[PDB]
Design a binder for this molecule. Structure first.
Ligand code: RL1
Length: 208
C-alpha cells in the first residue's frame, strides 16, 4: 500500500466540500454518472478502430448498487478504466486548473452545484461519503484499489479482490445522516432529474 498527498488545491477543495453547510447534496450522483459516461465514451471510441479492446467485456453500461447493511452506494461502469499513472498523477493533473477556477468562483459567489462545470465533480462524493474506495482495471494495466477518507491523502494498492474485467467501481461509504441515497425511490428520482440524457444503460440493483 502506497500513500500519496493530494495536489494542494484538490486537498483544499475537498476540505471545503466536507466543511461547508450545503443541503443540495444529491448532485454527487449526477457527477459520478457523468464521469462514468465519459469513461464509457473513451472505450467506445477506442473500440471503433480496435474491436479487440472489448475482449475484456463487450457491454457498456452503468450499474448503481445500494447496500443498506454496509451503508455503501456503489457506482459501477465498464468504461476504459484507469492505469496506475492515472490514479496517482493524471486525474490530479487534468483537474488542477478546474479546481483553482472553481475555488475562485466559490469565493465570487458561485454555488457548489456548479462543480461539474469545472470538471471536478468527482470530489462532490465527499458531500455524502466519509470514505471513497475506487476499484479500477484498464486493459493495459493491473487491477488497483484507490481509497481516501480525505484529510489530505489517498492510497493506491494492487487489488487481489474479485476481477472486474475492465472499468471503474466507485464505492461511497456514506455518512450516517446520508442514508437517503440508499433508497430506491430516491435514487430513481435523482437519476431522472439529473441524468436523463446519458447514452448508456443505467441499471439500479434493487436490494433483496
Ligand atoms: O475510469 C475512469 C473513471 C474515473 C472516475 C473519476 N473521476 N474523477 C476521479 C478522481 C479520482 C478517481 Br480514483 C476517479 N475519478 C469516475 O468517477 C468513473 C470512471 O469510470 N476514468 C476517468 C477519467 C479518465 C480520463 C482519462 C483516461 C482515463 C480515465 C478513466
Amino acid at each position: 500500500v502506497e500513500t500519496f498527498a493530494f495536489q494542494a488545491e484538490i486537498a483544499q477543495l475537498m476540505s471545503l466540500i466536507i466543511n461547508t453547510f450545503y443541503s443540495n447534496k444529491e448532485i454527487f450522483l449526477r457527477e459520478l454518472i457523468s464521469n462514468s459516461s465519459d469513461a464509457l465514451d473513451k472505450i467506445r471510441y477506442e473500440s471503433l478502430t480496435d474491436p479487440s479492446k472489448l475482449d475484456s467485456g463487450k457491454e457498456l453500461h452503468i450499474n448503481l448498487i445500494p447496500n443498506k447493511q454496509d451503508r455503501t452506494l456503489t457506482i459501477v461502469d465498464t468504461g476504459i478504466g484507469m492505469t496506475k499513472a492515472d490514479l496517482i498523477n493524471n486525474l490530479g493533473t487534468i483537474a488542477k486548473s478546474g479546481t483553482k477556477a472553481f475555488m475562485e468562483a466559490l469565493q465570487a459567489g458561485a454555488d457548489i452545484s456548479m462543480i461539474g462545470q469545472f470538471g471536478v465533480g468527482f470530489y462532490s462524493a465527499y458531500l455524502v461519503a466519509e470514505k471513497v474506495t475506487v476499484i479500477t482495471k484498464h486493459n493495459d494495466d493491473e487491477q488497483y484499489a484507490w481509497e481516501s477518507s480525505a484529510g489530505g491523502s489517498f492510497t493506491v494498492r494492487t487489488d487481489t479482490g474479485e476481477p472486474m474485467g475492465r472499468g471503474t467501481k466507485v464505492i461511497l461509504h456514506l455518512k450516517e445522516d446520508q442514508t437517503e441515497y440508499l433508497e430506491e425511490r430516491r435514487i430513481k428520482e435523482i437519476v431522472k432529474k439529473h441524468s436523463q440524457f446519458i447514452g448508456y444503460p443505467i441499471t439500479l440493483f434493487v436490494e433483496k
